[PDB]
């Protein structure tokens, strides 16, 4: 049975859940659910892996979005059809400000829309802005957990490579629009790049759904020393603790 086309879920599967935590990576879903009570796997189809658990006695969904606005737009739409009204994205990210360190946590107030899917919900003039209650819950959760936290604007790119002005690529070329762009965002105070928030925040803010976004910084584009696949996992766990603690305040 499925009430929706991609996720393979029914309303019954949600057990009344109205909040979903939405990481990008299917493999992180089980790990996040493990911070809560009585987690159980619901489904796995394409990049959409879903689990249900209990937070302070209330059902909550954890469901992966895959990379990018398009897959995110599917997961969010179908979760909304199923009854979800609040979405918390938990991600990993690359900071672009020299003063933001690996291990820091970033809470996004709004995003630069360097994506395409957001435009399928609202014209570019519309802000990709987070819900105030969600953002508040994330900031407060960061204080409860104890973290070095920055709150601000994130650049949300449809690509990992040229849209984040990476030159270490097959072509070594960046299209005109994005040449010099990282320095421009840096000067405008943008904290970081990631790949799903513009779509998530725009589609929710324009349809009466609540969304928030938190990420752990696993690399800094300005520093020469690159952490290993050890320190980066610790950072992940930190931000994950925060998103679950934030969810508790939103039930």
Binders of a copy of itself in range 129-158 (CB under 8 A):
129-132, 135-136, 139, 151-153, 157-158
> Smallest distance, Å, CB 117 to a copy of itself?
4
- Whether 150 sits among the annotated catalytic residues: the reply is no
- Whether 166 sits among the annotated catalytic residues: the reply is yes
One-character DSSP codes across the chain? --SSSSS---HHHHTT--EEEEES-GGGHHHHHTTSEEEEEEEEETTEEEEEEEETTEEEEEE---SSHHHHHHHHHHHHHHT--EEEEEEEEEE-STT--TT-EEEEEEEEEE-SGGGGTS-TTS-EE--HHHHHHHHHHHHHH---EEEEEEEEES-SSGGGT---SSS----GGGTTHHHHHHHTT--EEESSHHHHHHHHHTTT-EEEEEEEEEEETT-SPPPPTTHHHHHHHHHHHHHHHHHHT--
Query: Which of these is catalytic: 47, 77, 78, 194?
Result: 78
x/- map, 36-75, a copy of itself, by CB under 8 A? ---------xxx------------------xxxxxx-xx-
x/- map, 78-107, a copy of itself, by CB under 8 A? --xx-------------------------x
**Is 113 near a copy of itself (CB under 8 A)?**
yes
56 versus 184: smaller Cβ distance to a copy of itself: 184
**Is 186 near a copy of itself (CB under 8 A)?**
no
């Amino acid at each position: 049975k499925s009430d929706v086309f991609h996720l393979g879920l029914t309303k019954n599967d949600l057990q009344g859940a109205q909040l979903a935590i939405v990481p990008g990576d299917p493999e992180r879903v089980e790990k996040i659910a493990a911070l809560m009570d009585k987690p159980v796997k619901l489904a796995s189809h394409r990049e959409f892996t879903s689990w249900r658990a209990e937070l302070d006695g209330k059902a909550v969904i954890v469901c992966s979005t895959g990379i990018g606005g398009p897959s995110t737009s599917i997961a969010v739409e179908e979760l909304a059809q199923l009854g979800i009204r609040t979405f918390l994205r938990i991600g990993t990210t690359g900071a672009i400000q020299p003063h933001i360190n690996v291990g820091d946590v970033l809470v996004t107030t709004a995003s630069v829309r360097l994506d395409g899917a957001s435009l399928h919900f609202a014209p570019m003039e519309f802000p990709a802005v987070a819900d105030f209650a969600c953002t508040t819950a994330l900031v407060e959760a960061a204080k409860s957990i104890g973290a070095t936290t920055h709150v601000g604007v994130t650049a949300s790119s449809d690509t990992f490579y040229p849209g984040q002005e990476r030159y270490d690529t097959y072509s070594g070329r960046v299209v005109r629009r994005f040449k010099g762009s990282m320095e421009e965002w840096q000067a405008m105070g943008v904290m970081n790049y990631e790949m799903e928030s513009a779509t998530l925040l725009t589609m929710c803010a324009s349809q009466g759904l609540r969304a928030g976004m938190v990420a752990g910084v696993i690399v800094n584009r300005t520093q020469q020393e690159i952490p290993n696949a050890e320190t980066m996992k610790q950072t992940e766990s930190h931000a994950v603790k925060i998103v679950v603690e934030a969810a508790r305040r939103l039930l």
